[PDB]
């Protein structure tokens, strides 16, 4: 008599997606493929955390990355949070 009384309750009262991608989806130069992996840069979104005052001292592009971001609608030097969640 409690299962019956509550089945009558419908009768009475109720009547960025581009961020986490790997780095080889941008057609970058192979001289940078010896540069980005040396710093252990693994993510596209990690590359925006490592700003333009972080990357240039690897041996063997500063203007080219500004072209490849402005083509597909992004920016450099973003501050991210809870990243990477993996």
């Amino acid at each position: 008599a409690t299962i019956l009384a509550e089945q009558l309750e419908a009768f009475v009262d109720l009547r960025d997606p581009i961020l986490l991608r790997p780095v080889d989806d941008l057609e970058l130069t192979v001289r940078s493929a010896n540069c980005l992996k040396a710093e252990a840069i693994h993510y596209i979104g990690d590359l925006v955390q490592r700003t333009e005052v972080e990357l240039l001292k690897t041996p063997n592009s500063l203007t080219e990355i500004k072209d490849v971001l402005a083509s597909r609608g992004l920016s450099l030097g973003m501050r991210l949070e809870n990243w990477p969640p993996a």
Binding site: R21, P22, D24, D25
Partner: protein, 50 residues
């Protein structure tokens, strides 16, 4: 690989036409596999399970 044709060429036969390089025709082919090795490969990885 004879795609869209009826034959199979060699490095020399393709080298007979365009340029007479030998090891870099082999290095042109090996470069394109790196140009196709995992964002475009998501559709072609499904044909592995034959």
């Amino acid at each position: 690989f004879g795609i869209d044709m009826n034959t199979d060429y060699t490095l020399e036969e393709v080298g007979k036409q365009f340029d007479v390089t030998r090891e870099r025709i082999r290095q042109i082919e090996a470069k394109a596999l790196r140009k196709l090795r995992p964002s475009r490969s998501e559709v072609l990885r499904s044909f592995l399970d034959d």
